[PDB]
Amino acid sequence: AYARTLDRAVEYLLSCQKDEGYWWGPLLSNVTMEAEYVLLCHILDRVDRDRMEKIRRYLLHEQREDGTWALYPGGPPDLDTTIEAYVALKYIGMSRDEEPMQKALRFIQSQGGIESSRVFTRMWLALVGEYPWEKVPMVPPEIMFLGKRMPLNIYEFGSWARATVVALSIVMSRQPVFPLPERARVPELYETDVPPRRRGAKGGGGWIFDALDRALHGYQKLSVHPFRRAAEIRALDWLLERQAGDGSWGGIQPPWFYALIALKILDMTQHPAFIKGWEGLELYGVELDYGGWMFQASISPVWDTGLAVLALRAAGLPADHDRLVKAGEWLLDRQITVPGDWAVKRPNLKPGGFAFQFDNVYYPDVDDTAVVVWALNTLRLPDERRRRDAMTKGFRWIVGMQSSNGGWGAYDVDNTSDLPNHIPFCDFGEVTDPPSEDVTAHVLECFGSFGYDDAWKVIRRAVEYLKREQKPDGSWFGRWGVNYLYGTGAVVSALKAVGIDTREPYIQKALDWVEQHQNPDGGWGEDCRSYEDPAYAGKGASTPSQTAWALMALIAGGRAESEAARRGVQYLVETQRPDGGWDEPYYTGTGFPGDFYLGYTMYRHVFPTLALGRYKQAI
Ligand SMILES: CCCCCCCCCCCC[N+](C)(C)[O-]
């Protein structure tokens, strides 16, 4: 039955591979990327009219009938996202009169106007002189002076947040303004009768920081500030030292964008870092077939390549397949062999991790590494001297990254500080990088592929962590992939890989939860709403990737013979395209739970292939 489905699936993945031997599907997010880009270009005084047009097209192609934009397809209207899209559009040429503009405006005013938007949106607007700097939370460059064990120091923030803070402290230290032309002003974002509903920190705000902020703004207006210029240079140096090979900062847009702004302010437009930073941007841009242009919040080549191999190997391809060889070779060259910000917690730990993007040496993440090491373990390459060596290096790196509670985070060890989640400034997404279930689940299966079982103390502690984290209904939270279906699928398959008896009470409870959520069509869906409302747990339209995850949960749980499993396969077989791939108009990717979602273009193809391959071998 599934046989032809597999063959087509396989020949399809092979056609998507590059000549260098890697897979690289685009990463889908939301309109703010390009809205802020537009804004960025204004500040930098480097506007390409042609580029603006392709962006104008994209913003419109993305706006829904109601005149709004969401964080994910099919999601509720987002104020922040809509406000920025509105401004970019107005800067481009659109007059407030036009249909798209009007409908947007209405929504914006009904939500409390500009005063109801997040700090970032207000800040971006402040940068262009459309909102008082004094009403934006201050981040002083002096934060650069706080030491390693001292509270609130930069190393208490998650990777993503860390660079963003440093870069922003320079910007806020100067409170610059790049006035929009009179034609692009947007005072209309203020015209509202609705009281502005303000959003606090990610977990409540203390009146102290509230007081502190006012003090900071007052200190900002003093004629002199000692050691200020010193802290600025500290921040500048920090950024100079940590720039990525592609010119970006962290391989993600926020810090990159702010860093570029920071250098502009400091007359460093003729400086090497700025140049590479600016020109490096193109690599992240994507030309859309309909005449549009989009910007990637980040890029997933290493991730995509890692999974594709696993999928293709599970599909049935041999370890020595000339194509997979091309991939394993590439992967090896991608291994980081120098210390990064994680070394601040592990100075004696020898580097050997892997990063998400092409060249991001200071920020390898466990999730990538765990997958890449595992994937490498399946292959049979010419120089197994370098293969065994690379695996060994990666393996020990992962082990050394384990956190206190027995689980793994993404970038740092024990980035569990609670303090940062209370600051006024932090009202958008995760600020710390604490351990998560999924990453731990992947790390576990990685070890498992090597033969290590429950006997090993490392793995034992890990399992203890998972068991304690299991939800009441026997499900597992999906941190990076779209919820419970993702989390559960990841964990269960891992438990099986480390010699755990799937017969267990808690493991069976997980499998039941899975079956009890299957859709009529025989597939599995989970809307991104499962982050806000618990009623949406494992509830949504069926998607190839999610169906496949839940399917893995069953295959690993010894339930491949189940009825549930049979309809699952059928779904994929039926919904598959003639070319070999699957469609997926929904996001099954998670950046920040509740605030930022992702569309991993490859998921819809890779997972079903992996899931299917695993099913065939289960016979
Ligand atoms: C707010 C936009 C910044 C992008 C959010 C970061 C996306 C990169 C995430 C790296 C983690 C990916 N993964 C699967 C390996 O865990």
Residue ranges of domains in the chain, CATH in brackets:
1-26+299-619 (1.50.10.20), 27-298 (1.50.10.20)
Give φ, ψ of 335 to 5 degrees: -70, 125
Atom of ligand 1 at shortest distance to CA of 596? 1
Q: Helices (H), strands (E): how many in the chain?
A: 22, 5
Element (H, E) at 417: none
Q: Which residues contact 21 (CB under 8 A, 6 or more apart)?
A: 305, 323, 326, 327, 329, 330
- Nearest CA to 163 among 298, 293, 279? 298
Contact between residue 202 and residue 429 where contact means Cβ atoms under 8 Å apart: yes
**CA 591–ligand 1 middle distance (angstroms):** 6
Nearest CA to ligand 1 atom 10: 356
Element (H, E) at 55: helix 49-62
Ligand 1 pocket, mutate which of 307, 480, 587, 601 (most atoms under 8 A from CB): 480
Atom of ligand 1 at shortest distance to CA of 27? 7
Atom of ligand 1 at shortest distance to CA of 481? 14
**CA 414–ligand 1 middle distance (angstroms):** 18
In terms of C-beta density within 10 A (0-12 exposed, 13-18 middle, 19 or more buried), how is residue 567 classed?
A: middle
Nearest CA to ligand 1 atom 6: 591
Nearest CA to ligand 1 atom 9: 591
**CA 590–ligand 1 middle distance (angstroms):** 8
Q: How far is CA 339 from the centre of its chain?
A: 23
Amino acid at the residue 287 = E
Give φ, ψ of 175 to 5 degrees: 40, 60
Which residues surround ligand 1 with Cβ inside 6 Å?
A: 160, 252-254, 297-298, 303, 356, 365, 367-368, 410, 480, 591, 596
Contact between residue 67 and residue 102 where contact means Cβ atoms under 8 Å apart: yes
Q: What angle do CA 499, 505, 506 make, to 5 degrees?
A: 75
**CA 357–ligand 1 middle distance (angstroms):** 10
Nearest CA to ligand 1 atom 5: 591
The technique is X-ray
Which residues lie across from 285 on neighbouring strands? 295
Nearest CA to ligand 1 atom 2: 297
Contact between residue 291 and residue 336 where contact means Cβ atoms under 8 Å apart: no
Q: Are strands 27-28 and 285-287 parallel, antiparallel or unpaired?
A: unpaired
**CA 284–ligand 1 middle distance (angstroms):** 14
**CA 300–ligand 1 middle distance (angstroms):** 9
368 is catalytic: no
Which residues lie across from 535 on neighbouring strands? none
Could you say which of 246, 365, 367, 433 is catalytic?
A: 367
Contact between residue 367 and residue 355 where contact means Cβ atoms under 8 Å apart: no
In whole angstroms, what is the distance from residue 373 CA to residue 278 CA? 33
Atom of ligand 1 at shortest distance to CA of 365? 15
Residue that has been written with the tokens 């605030």 in this structure: 595
Buried b / exposed e over 261-277, threshold 16 CB at 10 Å, is: bbbbbeebeeeebbeeb
